[PDB]
Design an enzyme around this catalytic site. Structure first.
Site, short mmCIF file in Angstrom:
data_model
loop_
_atom_site.label_atom_id
_atom_site.label_comp_id
_atom_site.label_asym_id
_atom_site.label_seq_id
_atom_site.Cartn_x
_atom_site.Cartn_y
_atom_site.Cartn_z
N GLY A 1 5.56 5.16 3.51
CA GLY A 1 6.94 5.01 3.50
C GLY A 1 7.28 3.61 3.85
O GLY A 1 8.56 3.10 3.48
N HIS B 1 2.92 -1.53 -6.26
CA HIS B 1 2.45 -0.43 -6.14
C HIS B 1 3.45 0.96 -5.94
O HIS B 1 3.33 2.08 -6.00
CB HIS B 1 1.37 0.01 -5.26
N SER C 1 5.58 1.00 2.81
CA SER C 1 5.15 0.05 1.50
C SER C 1 6.31 -0.64 1.00
O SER C 1 7.70 0.01 1.00
CB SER C 1 4.58 0.68 0.61
N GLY C 2 6.16 -1.97 0.78
CA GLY C 2 7.52 -2.71 0.02
C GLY C 2 8.30 -3.50 0.73
O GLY C 2 9.08 -4.15 0.66
N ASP D 1 0.45 -7.98 -5.24
CA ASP D 1 1.44 -6.45 -5.15
C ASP D 1 2.93 -6.94 -4.89
O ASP D 1 3.24 -6.64 -3.71
CB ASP D 1 0.75 -5.82 -3.87
#
Lengths: 239, 59
Positions: free
Chosen positions: A187, A53, A189-190, A98
């Site tokens: 911020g 995402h 995410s990932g 994801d």
């Protein structure tokens, strides 16, 4: 992999500032201007794993070896992205699967502050209640991002307990953690959710989604790496 | 006339990214920036101010 040259010291909302360089695999994904939009984890010198995402493109850059994003003098590595491999099974509706892999144009130069996190085996079982750690430059209050890298220790949650809140929104490629006084936030995410496997920090989850207000009493949801690692290995092998 | 989705407040969503997007603010008549989480975007969410103005300008 999974062994920081600089050992972290543990006592993101309600987290704490990390020891500089103690999470060497943590990278910042930024646009051409240096704007941080997502985190990521180095899995080797040429590849970074992040969330699907995050929508990373070859115009964005991977920043490794960073601690204080407010420091212009701090030494870091701005790495260009050669190609983006978004898992074709990523469901933009349910957010399942994801995960995205980033192949760097030029290899990252591993050092005291830059190295890889270990990947788990598809059959690995990280028990609920296990104390893991998540890191990133996401908001510390639900607002601008903290300049310095943050960290937080939090427990993995059983799917049963996670579903007690999120119900059927929890899919097979998701794992929950938190609801313990800390929360990933915009911020983060990932970024990584790591747990020790025989003493080495191993990527168990990738920051994905959760409370829309970053509530610390709600389960945080992460992409379950064990369910996606075979895809990761296959992608690396073919590229 | 413009689509009603142009009058909806910006929607960050449940994902935890920090992605810059644009939304039309009927109170000001301009497209403003906001932080999008990366998933489940509503329609008043554009990748450029131009796209936003061409779709929602004047709502």
């Amino acid at each position: 992999c999974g062994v920081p040259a600089i050992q972290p010291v543990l006592s993101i909302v309600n987290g704490e500032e990390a020891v500089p360089g103690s999470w060497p695999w943590q990278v910042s994904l930024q646009d051409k201007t240096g704007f941080h939009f997502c985190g990521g984890s180095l899995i080797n010198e040429n590849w970074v794993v992040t969330a699907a995402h995050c929508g990373v493109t070859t115009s964005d850059v991977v920043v490794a070896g960073e601690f204080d994003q407010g420091s212009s003098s701090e030494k870091i590595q701005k790495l260009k992205i050669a190609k983006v491999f978004k898992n074709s099974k990523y469901n933009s509706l349910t957010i399942n699967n994801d995960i995205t892999l980033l192949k760097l144009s030029t290899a990252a130069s591993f050092s005291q502050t830059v190295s890889a996190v270990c990947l788990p085996s598809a059959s690995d079982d990280f028990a609920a209640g296990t104390t893991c750690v998540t890191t990133g430059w996401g908001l510390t209050r639900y607002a601008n991002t903290p300049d310095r890298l943050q960290q937080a220790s939090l427990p993995l949650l059983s799917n049963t307990n996670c579903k007690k809140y999120w119900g059927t929104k929890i899919k097979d490629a998701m794992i929950c953690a938190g609801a313990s006084g800390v929360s990933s936030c915009m911020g983060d995410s990932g970024g990584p959710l790591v747990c020790k496997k025989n003493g080495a920090w191993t990527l168990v989850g990738i920051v994905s989604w959760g409370s829309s207000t970053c509530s610390t009493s709600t389960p945080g949801v992460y992409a379950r790496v064990t369910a996606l690692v075979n895809w990761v290995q296959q992608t690396l092998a073919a590229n | 006339m413009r689509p009603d989705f142009c009058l909806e407040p910006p929607y960050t969503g449940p994902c935890m990214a920090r992605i810059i997007r644009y939304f039309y603010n009927a109170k000001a008549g301009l497209c403003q920036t906001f932080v999008y989480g990366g998933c489940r975007a509503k329609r008043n969410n554009f990748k450029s101010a131009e796209d936003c103005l061409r779709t929602c300008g004047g709502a």
